[PDB]
Amino acid sequence: GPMDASVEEEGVRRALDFAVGEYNKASNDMYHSRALQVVRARKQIVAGVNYFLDVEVGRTTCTKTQPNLDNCPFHDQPHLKRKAFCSFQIYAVPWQGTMTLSKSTCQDA
Amino acid sequence: GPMDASVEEEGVRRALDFAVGEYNKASNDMYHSRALQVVRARKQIVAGVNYFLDVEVGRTTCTKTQPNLDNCPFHDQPHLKRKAFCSFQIYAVPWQGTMTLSKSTCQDA
After folding, report:
1. Looking at the partner chain, which of B33, B40, B47 has a beta carbon nearest the beta carbon of A57?
2. Coil, helix or strand for A10?
């Protein structure tokens, strides 16, 4: 994984100032806090794949608690059916075999 | 930016099943929802740099609302001083000039 990097390095210093900026902004403290000591600084290049999916999604008549969900019929009754257009952004790191849902938003159709 | 990708492609299908999985888990709905139609599927390789910073952070006597904060003296009074060891993880995409704080946790020292 990650490897040691000098704090003198512009990237490491920029990231430190930034993190301490965010820590400060998120705090409920009226006092400014700042670094006493940097105990360790490491860094790692990462590549990944973003998928950007525009998908219409529809409500089915199966409950989440039952078998064979992936070709289950959509509701057709007046106040039961629901359809939305969703935008999903998925960040995959394939050597790791992981996926994260970075972004998710829908509008009723 | 991103480029069109067939839904037949194992990566695109895996990401779709995953997103719809998450959408379902996050919902308050007892019914299963599923894709009616995939309107678009695009994908983009991204590289970035994670910085992993272990930093002791100390409370200063300046307020957030005043000048010259970065060599301001630490509190020394009994119930005013505070010190913590923090772990920050910063995700940088340097062509874009952005940084995000992916992870942030501290323990009082």
Report:
1. B33
2. helix
Resolution in A: 2.5
CB contact at 8 A, B30 and A64: yes
Strands B31-63 and B83-93, by their bridges, are antiparallel
DSSP helix/strand/coil, A70: helix
Q: How was this structure determined?
A: X-ray
A7 touches chain B (CB under 8 A): no
User: With b meaning 16 or more CB within 10 Å and e meaning fewer, what string describes B36-73?
Assistant: beeeebebeeeebbbbbbebebbbbebeeeeeeeeebe
Instruction: Enter the DSSP assignment of B75.
Output: P
* Partners of A85 in the β-ladder: A56, A107
User: CB under 8 Å to B16, separation ≥6 — which residues?
Assistant: A51, A53, A55, A88, B7, B35, B38, B41
Gap positions in chain B, given as the residue before each gap (C–N > 2.5 A)?
none
Q: Which of A6, A38, A45, A52 to mutate to test the interface with B (most CBs of B within 10 A)?
A: A52
Domain boundaries, chain A: 1-109
Question: From residue A74, how far is each of A55, A83, A94, B55, B90 by CA, in Å?
Answer: 15, 9, 33, 53, 43
Tell which CATH classification among 3.30.1490.100, 2.30.42.10, 3.10.450.10, 3.40.50.300 matches the domain B1-109.
3.10.450.10
Q: Of the candidates B23, B31, B48, which has its C-beta nearest A60's C-beta? A: B31
